[PDB]
Ligand binder design. Structure first.
Ligand SMILES: O=P(O)(O)CC[C@H]1O[C@@H](O)[C@H](O)[C@@H](O)[C@@H]1O
Ligand code: ALF
Ligand SMILES: [Mg+2]
Ligand SMILES: [Mg+2]
Length: 218
């Protein structure tokens, strides 16, 4: 049986993928780039703050100073951090709180494998911190999603092999990161976005311990 579940945060635990999208699009438009629509945003899900800004600049062939780059990333983060102040336990996605409870009852380790430096704050806002056996610090890894490092680190932090772990993701980049870690991915979203080659569920109510077992037994 699997021994750990490795959670992405944004778009898996709560609806903060929407907030990142709104903040990045606002930033992009302030600098005169309007290609950041929902379709393009599928390339931004899972990607670090600086990598996201670079993808937006590259979309437009735009070349800012190092000083401006730093200011833009900070501006977007400051806006995002204001957006999330009112996140609460009521914003936890369907199924997720019960999944965490059921995993703990079955002695399955729970680790956060999020790129977000705002992750710990968000788990506290949602009264979820106590469910997590570890939070992999995304500043510690040498390579960000789609590299597998953050999922490998999350599994290591709870003493479980990636190959005995399930990863939960809503992003193209994150699904690739899970694949390359050796863990088993279960995506949440549209197969049109996430692929026809892994198990995908349409919403997080599908993330039950029963279903994770169903999939693992395979
Ligand atoms: O470090 P932060 O700026 O809080 C978030 C860094 C990245 O986290 C990921 O979980 C999201 O899918 C990305 O959209 C985001 O860019
Ligand atoms: F949506 Al994440 F790390 F929380 F990619
Ligand atoms: Mg996500
Ligand atoms: Mg604790």
């Amino acid at each position: 049986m699997f021994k750990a579940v490795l959670f992405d945060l944004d778009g898996v635990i709560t609806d903060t993928a929407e907030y990142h999208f709104r903040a990045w699009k606002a930033l992009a438009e302030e600098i005169g780039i309007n290609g950041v629509d929902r379709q393009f945003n599928e390339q931004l899900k899972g990607v670090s703050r600086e990598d996201s800004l670079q993808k937006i600049l590259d979309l437009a062939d735009k070349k800012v100073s190092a000083e401006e780059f730093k200011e833009l990333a900070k501006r977007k983060n400051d806006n995002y951090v204001k957006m999330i102040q009112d996140v609460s336990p009521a914003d936890v996605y369907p199924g997720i709180l019960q999944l965490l409870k059921d995993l703990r009852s079955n002695k399955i380790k729970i680790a956060l494998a999020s790129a977000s430096k705002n992750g710990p704050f968000l788990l506290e806002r949602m009264n979820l911190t106590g469910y997590f056996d570890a939070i992999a610090d995304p500043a510690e890894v040498a390579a960000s999603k789609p590299a597998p490092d953050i999922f490998i680190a999350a599994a290591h932090a709870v003493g479980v092999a990636p190959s005995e772990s399930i990863g939960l993701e809503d992003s193209q980049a994150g699904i690739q990161a899970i694949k390359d870690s050796g863990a088993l991915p279960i995506g949440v979203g549209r197969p049109e976005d996430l692929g026809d080659d892994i198990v995908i569920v349409p919403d997080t109510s599908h993330y039950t311990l029963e279903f994770l077992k169903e999939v693992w037994l395979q």
